[PDB]
Scaffold this active site. Structure first.
Site, mmCIF file in Angstrom:
data_model
loop_
_atom_site.group_PDB
_atom_site.id
_atom_site.type_symbol
_atom_site.label_atom_id
_atom_site.label_comp_id
_atom_site.label_asym_id
_atom_site.label_seq_id
_atom_site.Cartn_x
_atom_site.Cartn_y
_atom_site.Cartn_z
ATOM 1 N N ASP A 267 0.831 -1.195 0.000
ATOM 2 C CA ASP A 267 0.000 0.000 0.000
ATOM 3 C C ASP A 267 0.872 1.254 0.000
ATOM 4 O O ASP A 267 0.428 2.315 -0.420
ATOM 5 C CB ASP A 267 -0.975 0.011 1.179
ATOM 6 C CG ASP A 267 -0.318 -0.331 2.503
ATOM 7 O OD1 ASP A 267 0.101 -1.492 2.665
ATOM 8 O OD2 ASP A 267 -0.217 0.571 3.362
ATOM 9 N N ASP A 268 2.118 1.116 0.459
ATOM 10 C CA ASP A 268 3.027 2.247 0.563
ATOM 11 C C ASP A 268 4.282 2.009 -0.282
ATOM 12 O O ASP A 268 5.352 2.517 0.049
ATOM 13 C CB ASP A 268 3.350 2.547 2.031
ATOM 14 C CG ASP A 268 3.779 1.338 2.855
ATOM 15 O OD1 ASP A 268 3.980 0.241 2.269
ATOM 16 O OD2 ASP A 268 3.917 1.504 4.089
#
Length: 596
Positions: A267-268
């Site tokens: 997600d990052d």
């Protein structure tokens, strides 16, 4: 007369006959049944103080418990075949198993040991509600709609204590959950310092949690963020090989304390999508070497339809979809706080090439720390079929989260038969056996996260709402409120009593201290509403000095309701229940009385 079993079994059948349980039972385990599964039966036996001896055959004189696996050609498999109880067509389904109660035989046949365990959990539910030593002859033919059912510690906030993580695993395990995804944001060693082994003290703490996972079969799933700025180096064949050595080492460390399933979180993530695939290809090779590691979970950088640009030809998702077929890619829906819809899953499938694993951002309250969210599963559509399973991302308040865990467990197991309203109501007796009416009362008035920046709005005070509205119109449209006031004062007295009796009745110190501030706020709201209603009544009767004093009491209680404080990561937060209808009513009363 029939037993309440959650999650709702796919199929349960009763016949007229009943059975008597003996004090001493014969227990037969096939060779495929693991230690965790044996221990689960022994738990079940001790609920009714049944002593046991283990043997390899049905004893005609005693009560018999046989636990077995389908197509093992073991004793229990044989018993099911020879007695012609079921269909092989059953066992292709997820977590498929059969529970049979017939004469002096209580049998469970699962597709594997995990499924046998679920079977025995259904027996645990049955045994916990048996009045005496009489048991109805029945046949459960059960399976799960979803591959994965559980919860993820993946919010922004104060991490759960180890005590609470174990307790949630213990809870999920009672409702056939199979997943606890460990993704706490403060753990330097799953992210940023992912290269460095966990300190020994920290690893030993993990191993205690993993053991609870093994015992409850609500497995501990460890996760990693390897694609940050300082992350996995894809500069060269040399540098990547160096970094692949470390990730595998780290996985080995967790493996060594019993972790058997892993998540990779992107997600990052920083680099190209191609690299993410490269890694997963290399991790899959490792996973197959180990032989007993369940399939990987992957959280993509693009995890909503919105951030995918609504593009079914989105480059990132198309690439991600070329990673090995076994990997379960997660999705939160159309938006960050997505609902469960057929359409969002159709989109995901069209874009990625496989069905989604749903990450449900409820009842996470980082979106509004003033809230406890303990309402029914409004976001769970029973008609949606096209997805692999669901995990709930709950509140920093672990015990309060049990309400949603129950919902996701029930819905995750049996989708079509999910009764939002009934399931919610039935849950309280399981969550809190001594004060279930009281905690249900609290949950009725603590469920709406609005206002919040995402714009999620859930019902709260739904049963009380028509009563509030009727009192308001009567008062405002200059009608008598003398009679109706009795009705509504009954409602508020029940709330107040709940807030006063709860701490006395509940034996769960962890829940009590967690929710105290909310109960304190709600107590004040109840006192405030009663004072205001009392003021309106006194006013109609013409006792103006008295209605003045009530009005003042009403103002003081409302202020009081705002005086409480609870811990958040950065400092303190003001607990604020009853915002959808309770507080608006108080405000309405205070505006109408004296301007009427």
């Amino acid at each position: 007369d029939e037993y309440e079993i959650y999650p709702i079994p796919q199929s349960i059948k009763y016949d007229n006959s009943i059975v008597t349980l003996g004090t001493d039972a014969n227990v037969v385990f096939e060779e495929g049944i693991d230690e965790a599964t044996k221990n689960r039966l022994l738990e079940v036996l001790s609920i009714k103080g049944i002593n046991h001896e283990e043997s390899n055959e049905i004893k005609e004189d005693k009560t018999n418990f046989l636990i077995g696996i389908n197509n093992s050609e073991g004793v229990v498999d044989k018993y099911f075949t020879d007695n012609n109880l079921v269909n092989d067509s059953h066992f292709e389904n997820h977590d498929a198993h059969v529970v049979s109660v017939k004469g002096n035989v209580i049998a469970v046949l699962g597709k594997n040991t995990d499924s046998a365990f679920y079977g025995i959990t259904s027996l645990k539910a049955i045994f916990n509600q048996l009045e005496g030593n009489e048991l109805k002859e029945l046949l459960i033919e059960d399976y799960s709609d979803g591959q994965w059912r559980g919860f993820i510690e993946g919010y922004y906030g104060i991490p759960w204590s180890n005590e609470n993580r174990k307790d949630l695993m213990k809870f999920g395990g009672d409702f056939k959950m199979n997943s606890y995804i460990f993704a706490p944001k403060d753990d330097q060693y799953h992210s940023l310092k992912w290269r460095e082994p966990y300190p020994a003290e920290k690893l030993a703490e993990i191993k205690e949690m993993v053991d609870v996972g093994i015992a409850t079969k609500n497995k501990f799933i460890w996760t990693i963020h390897p694609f940050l700025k300082d992350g996995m180096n894809f500069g060269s064949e040399e540098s990547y090989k160096a970094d692949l050595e470390k990730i595998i080492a780290k996985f080995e460390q967790l493996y060594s304390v019993g972790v058997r399933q892993f998540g990779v979180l992107a997600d990052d993530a920083e680099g190209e999508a191609n690299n993410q695939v490269k890694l997963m290809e290399d991790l899959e090779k490792w996973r197959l070497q180990k032989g007993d590691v369940y399939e990987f979970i992957f959280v993509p950088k693009v995890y909503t339809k919105e951030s995918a640009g609504g593009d079914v030809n989105n480059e990132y998702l198309k690439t991600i979809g070329t990673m090995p077929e076994t990997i379960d890619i997660m999705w939160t829906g159309d938006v960050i706080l997505g609902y469960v819809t057929q359409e969002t899953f159709e989109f995901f499938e069209e874009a990625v090439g496989r069905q989604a694993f749903m990450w449900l951002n409820w009842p996470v309250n980082d979106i509004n720390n003033k809230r406890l969210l303990m309402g029914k599963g409004e976001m769970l559509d029973p008609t949606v079929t096209n997805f692999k399973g669901i995990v709930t991302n709950p509140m920093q308040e672990a015990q309060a989260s049990k309400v949603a865990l129950f919902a996701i467990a029930d819905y995750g197991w049996n989708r079509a038969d999910f009764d939002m309203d009934k399931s919610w109501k039935d849950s309280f007796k399981y969550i809190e056996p001594d004060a279930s009416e009281e905690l249900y009362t609290f949950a009725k008035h603590m469920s709406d996260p609005a206002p919040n920046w995402h714009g999620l709005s859930l019902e709260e005070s739904e049963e009380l709402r028509p009563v509030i509205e009727e009192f308001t119109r009567r008062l405002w449209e200059k009608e008598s409120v003398l009679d109706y006031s009795k009705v509504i004062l009954d409602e508020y007295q029940e709330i107040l009593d709940a807030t006063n009796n709860f701490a006395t009745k509940s034996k769960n110190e962890l829940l009590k201290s967690e929710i105290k501030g909310w109960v304190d706020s709600l107590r004040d709201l109840a006192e405030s509403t009663i004072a205001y209603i009392n003021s309106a009544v006194a006013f109609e009767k013409g006792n103006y000095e008295e209605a003045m004093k009530y009005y003042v009491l009403g103002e003081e209680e409302y202020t009081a309701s705002r005086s409480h404080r609870t811990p958040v990561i950065n400092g303190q937060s003001r607990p604020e229940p009853g915002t959808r209808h309770l507080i608006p009513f108080i405000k309405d009363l205070s505006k109408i009385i004296g301007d009427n």
